[PDB]
C-alpha cells in the first residue's frame, strides 16, 4: 500500500537500543538553549515578497509534546526539540542571536552607534524578519557592518533582507569576509547537486512523525530569492585584529575546513568565541551527501586545536552560526578538545584501517568512536555520520575504487540487474525470500538486493513497495537527519513516482567570467559540436577582461587575458550586460541596437555557439533507471 506503515517490532527494538547506549540523563543543553531568551514570537510565519512562505514552525508542533514516537530515533528527536528553541537571545553583553528563524543563526553585536551583524541567513525575508525582532526588543539601530563567517548560502543568502547595495557602494555599510570568500561561494554540478539535495533535505516530504522532523544544525532551510552582496574588506593571512564601531574583533581564518573560506571570531571584551560552523551541536559533514568536494578532517582538527590554544583557554562563552551556546571556561575547553579529537579520530583511525586494507566499502562497518567521544551530544552524527565521514575520508585519500579488479569496470546497475534476478530464481522467488529477510529485520540487506529487482524491472509494483518498506523501516531508525530524510524520500518516489511536469541575479554576477565560460563549457551538446570549429575574442571593458573562446573537438575552451589575430569574430560587451543577456533581463537584439553588444568579423558565430546548448531536467531518476 502507498502510505507510511507503522514502525516494525525490530525498528522499535532499535529505538530501545538507542536509549540503552546514549546518556539521556545528561539534559544540560536544554538549559543552555533556554538561557537568555528575550522574545519568542507566539507563532512564526515569514513570507517572501512573492507571497510564498519562506519559514514556518507550526508544522513541527507534534514535537512540542516531547512524547516518544518510535518512527523517530529518540536521540534525533532530542536534537529536533533543542532546534525548536527559537527566537531572540543574549549570549553575552551586547552580543545577541536570533535562532530558529532559518537553518542558521544571524548574530548581532552592539557597537557604539549600531549593529555589527554576523551572517544573514539563507534568504532576504528571514534576515529581515530577524532584524525586526532586534528592532522591536532591543530598540532600532542601523546596520553599519555585516560579517560573513564563511562562504555558504546559509550565511550570505539573505543579505538583501538587511542592507541594500547603495549603502555598500556609498559606504554606510561595510561587508567583511575571509580571503577566499568570493571564489568559494562559487555551479558545475548544480543540477545534480540540487536534485540529490531534495533527497537529503526531504523537500517533498511533509513535516511530521513519518516525514521531516529536523535538519541537524537547524529545523530546515528557508526558501526564496537567494541574494549576494560582495565584501568591501577581506581578512587575509592568518587573521586580523580589527575595531568595528568601537568593539574589538579577532578573526582567525580556518581555510579549507567546513568551507574553503571561513573564520572564527574572538571577541575579547565579552570573552566570546564565535566558532563559525567549525564547532556546532553535532558532528559536521566531511562529505555532504548532496554531492561535493571532500573536506580536510586533518586541517579541520588542527584549526580547532589552534582556537583552543589561542582563545579556548580564556573564553567564557562559545557560540556558533548554528545551534546554541555553552558557557563556562571548563565546558568550553572540554568541548573544543573533544571536537578537535572527533575530526582527528575520524581521520587518523580511518586511514589506520585503510593501511590495514579495509576498503571504502567496509570502513564504515569497522570504525567506532571511543566512549569519551560517543557519549557526547555535540559529537553525535546528526548532520554528518560516523559512517559516511570515514568513507569520505577513505575516499579523499584513495578514491572511489577498493583495489579489487572485480569492481574496476562494473556494468551499470540497470544492465547488471537482469542477471542478478535470473540467478536468484526470478522476481517472484527473489521477493518471496526477500520478504523472509524483511520479516526478520535485515533492512540494510533487503534494500541492497531488492534494489537489483527494481532496476531489472522498475514497473514491478511488488519490487518497489517492499523496497520502500525496507527503506522506511531504515529511516525511522536513523539518528542522522540527512539519512532519515534521504531514505524516506526514496520510499516516497518508489510508492508514487517522481513529479512529471516539474535565477539569482547576485549569483551570476558573483560568478567569475572564466567560470561562466567553464559553466558554459558544461552546456555543450557534443552531438551539435561534432565536426564544428570556431574561435571568438570576447572583451568586457567594464571590468577590463578579455578572453579567448575556442570551440574545437566538441569542447569549449576559454582563456583570460589573451586575444587572437585569427579569431573569426570579435565581440565587445560589458559583463553586466552579458549577465542581463543570460538572465533574459534585456534582449540581445535590444543590446546590439543599443550599441551595448558590438561585433566584428562573422557576426553569426557567437549565436551559433549558444544555439548548440542543451539543458538539464531537474527531476531525474535516482531510485530507478532513467524513465
Binding residues (CB under 5 A) for Zn ion: these are 104, 152, 154, 277
Q: Which of 471, 536, 540, 597 is close enough to bind a second copy by CB under 8 A? A: 471
> Locate cell 546559509: which residue?
154
Residue 433: name its binding partner from Zn ion, a second copy, none (Cβ under 5 to 8 Å by kind): a second copy
Residues 306-325 that bind a second copy (CB under 8 A): 306, 309
Residue 104: name its binding partner from Zn ion, a second copy, none (Cβ under 5 to 8 Å by kind): Zn ion
Q: Is 378 in the site for a second copy (CB under 8 A)?
A: no
Q: Which of 42, 112, 237, 404 is close enough to bind a second copy by CB under 8 A? A: 404
Give the residue with the Cβ less far from Zn ion, 14 or 175.
175
Is 496 among the annotated ligand-binding positions? no
Query: Of 23-31, 86-94, 243-251, 441-449, which segment contacts a second copy by CB under 8 A?
Result: 441-449
Q: Is 377 in the site for a second copy (CB under 8 A)?
A: no
Residue 277: name its binding partner from Zn ion, a second copy, none (Cβ under 5 to 8 Å by kind): Zn ion
Distances (CA, A) of 270 to 84, 149, 167, 338, 606: 27, 18, 29, 24, 58
Residue 306: name its binding partner from a second copy, Zn ion, none (Cβ under 5 to 8 Å by kind): a second copy
Give residues with Cβ within 8 angstroms of 30, minimum separation 6.
81, 82
Q: 597-613 b/e with 16+ CB inside 10 Å = b?
A: bebeeeeebbeebeebe
- Name the minimum Å distance from CB 284 to Zn ion: 9
Q: 203-235 b/e with 16+ CB inside 10 Å = b?
A: ebbebbbbbbbbbbbbbbbbbbbbbbbbbeeeb
Give the residue with the Cβ less far from Zn ion, 254 or 395.
254
Is 565 among the annotated ligand-binding positions? no
Q: Are 457 and 626 in contact (CB under 8 A)?
A: no
Q: Which of 1, 25, 31, 355 is close enough to bind a second copy by CB under 8 A? A: 355
How far is 438 from 432, CA to CA, in rounded Å?
10
Is 347 among the annotated ligand-binding positions? no
> Locate cell 509534546: which residue?
65
Q: Are 120 and 150 in contact (CB under 8 A)?
A: no
Q: Is 518 in the site for a second copy (CB under 8 A)?
A: yes
Residues 546-575 that bind a second copy (CB under 8 A): 548, 550, 552-557, 559, 562
Phi, psi of 558 (to 5 degrees): -145, 145
Grid cell of 105 as nine digits: 543563526
Grid cell of 23 as nine digits: 546518556
CA-based radius of gyration for the chain: 26
Nearest to 392 by CA among 284, 465, 526: 284
Q: Are 125 and 113 in contact (CB under 8 A)?
A: no
Give the residue with the Cβ less far from a second copy, 235 or 363.
363
Residue 154: name its binding partner from Zn ion, a second copy, none (Cβ under 5 to 8 Å by kind): Zn ion
Strands 106-110 and 53-56: unpaired
- Name the minimum Å distance from CB 257 to Zn ion: 10
Q: Is 193 in the site for a second copy (CB under 8 A)?
A: yes
Is 309 among the annotated ligand-binding positions? no
Q: Which residues pair with 117 in a beta bridge?
A: 108, 146
Give the residue with the Cβ less far from Zn ion, 277 or 376.
277
User: Binding site: residue ranges?
Assistant: 150, 152, 154-155, 258, 277, 285-290, 295, 322, 383
User: Binding site for sulfate: residue ranges?
Assistant: 285-290, 295, 383
User: Binding site for Zn(2+): residue ranges?
Assistant: 150, 152, 154-155, 258, 277, 322
Amino acid at each position: 500500500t502507498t502510505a507510511p506503515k507503522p514502525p516494525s517490532a525490530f525498528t522499535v527494538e532499535a529505538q530501545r537500543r538507542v536509549e540503552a547506549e546514549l546518556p539521556f540523563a545528561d539534559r544540560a543543553d536544554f538549559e543552555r538553549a533556554d538561557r537568555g531568551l528575550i522574545r519568542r514570537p507566539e507563532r512564526l510565519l515569514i513570507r517572501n515578497p512573492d507571497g510564498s512562505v519562506a519559514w514556518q514552525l507550526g508544522g513541527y508542533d507534534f514535537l512540542l509534546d516531547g512524547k516518544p514516537r518510535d518512527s523517530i530515533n529518540p536521540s534525533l528527536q532530542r536534537q529536533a526539540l533543542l532546534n525548536l528553541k527559537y527566537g531572540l537571545f543574549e549570549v553575552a553583553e551586547g552580543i545577541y542571536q536570533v535562532r530558529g528563524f532559518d537553518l542558521a543563526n544571524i548574530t548581532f553585536i552592539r557597537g557604539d552607534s549600531g549593529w555589527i551583524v554576523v551572517d544573514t541567513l539563507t534568504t532576504p525575508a528571514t534576515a529581515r524578519a530577524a532584524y525586526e525582532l532586534v528592532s522591536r526588543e532591543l530598540g532600532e539601530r542601523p546596520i553599519r557592518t555585516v560579517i560573513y563567517s564563511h562562504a555558504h548560502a546559509d550565511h550570505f543568502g539573505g543579505v538583501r533582507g538587511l542592507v541594500e547595495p547603495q549603502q555598500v557602494a556609498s559606504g554606510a555599510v561595510q561587508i567583511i569576509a575571509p580571503a577566499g570568500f568570493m571564489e568559494a561561494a562559487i555551479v558545475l554540478a548544480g543540477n545534480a547537486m540540487m536534485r540529490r539535495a531534495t533527497y537529503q533535505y526531504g523537500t517533498q516530504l511533509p513535516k511530521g512523525p513519518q516525514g521531516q522532523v529536523d535538519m541537524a544544525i537547524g529545523k530546515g532551510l528557508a526558501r526564496g530569492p537567494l541574494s549576494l552582496l560582495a565584501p568591501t574588506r577581506l581578512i587575509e593571512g592568518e587573521g586580523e585584529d580589527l575595531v568595528l564601531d568601537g568593539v574589538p574583533f579577532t578573526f582567525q581564518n580556518t581555510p579549507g575546513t567546513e568551507s574553503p573560506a571561513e573564520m572564527n571570531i574572538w571577541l575579547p571584551r565579552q570573552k566570546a568565541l564565535l566558532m563559525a560552523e567549525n564547532v556546532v551541536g553535532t558532528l559536521h559533514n566531511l562529505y555532504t551527501l548532496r554531492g561535493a568536494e571532500v573536506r580536510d578532517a586533518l586541517g579541520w582538527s588542527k584549526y580547532i586545536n589552534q582556537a583552543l590554544h589561542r582563545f579556548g583557554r580564556q573564553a567564557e562563552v562559545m557560540f556558533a552560526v548554528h545551534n546554541w551556546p555553552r558557557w563556562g571556561n571548563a565546558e568550553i575547553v572540554e568541548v573544543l578538545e573533544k571536537q578537535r579529537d572527533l575530526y582527528g579520530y575520524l581521520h587518523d583511525q580511518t586511514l589506520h584501517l585503510a593501511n590495514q586494507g579495509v576498503t571504502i566499502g567496509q570502513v564504515h562497518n569497522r570504525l567506532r568512536l571511543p566512549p569519551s567521544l560517543d557519549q557526547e551530544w555535540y559529537d553525535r552524527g546528526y548532520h554528518g555520520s560516523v559512517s559516511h565521514n570515514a568513507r569520505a575520508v577513505l575516499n579523499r585519500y584513495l578514491g572511489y575504487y577498493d583495489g579489487n579488479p572485480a569492481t574496476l569496470d562494473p556494468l551499470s546497475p540497470e544492465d547488471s540487474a537482469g542477471r542478478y534476478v535470473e540467478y536468484m530464481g526470478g522476481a517472484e522467488r527473489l521477493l518471496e525470500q526477500a520478504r523472509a529477510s524483511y520479516a526478520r529485520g535485515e533492512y540494510r540487506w533487503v534494500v541492497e538486493v531488492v534494489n537489483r529487482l527494481v532496476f531489472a524491472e522498475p514497473d514491478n509494483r511488488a519490487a518497489r513497495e517492499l523496497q520502500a518498506d525496507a527503506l522506511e523501516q531504515l529511516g525511522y531508525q536513523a539518528e542522522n537527519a540527512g539519512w532519515r530524510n534521504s531514505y524516506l524520500s526514496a520510499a516516497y518516489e518508489l510508492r508514487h513516482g517522481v513529479p512529471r511536469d516539474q535565477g539569482s541575479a547576485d549569483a551570476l554576477a558573483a560568478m567569475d567570467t572564466g567560470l561562466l565560460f567553464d559553466y558554459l563549457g558544461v552546456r555543450l551538446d557534443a552531438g551539435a559540436a561534432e565536426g564544428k570549429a570556431l574561435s571568438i575574442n570576447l572583451r568586457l571593458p567594464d571590468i577590463g577582461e578579455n578572453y579567448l573562446l575556442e570551440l574545437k573537438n566538441s569542447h569549449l575552451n576559454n582563456l583570460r587575458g589573451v586575444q587572437s589575430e585569427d579569431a573569426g569574430q570579435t565581440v565587445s560587451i560589458d559583463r553586466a550586460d552579458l549577465n542581463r543577456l543570460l538572465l533574459k533581463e534585456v534582449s540581445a537584439v535590444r543590446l546590439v541596437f543599443e550599441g551595448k553588444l558590438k561585433s566584428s568579423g562573422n557576426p553569426l558565430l557567437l549565436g551559433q555557439l549558444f544555439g548548440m546548448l542543451g539543458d538539464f531536467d531537474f527531476w531525474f531518476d535516482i531510485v530507478t533507471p532513467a524513465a
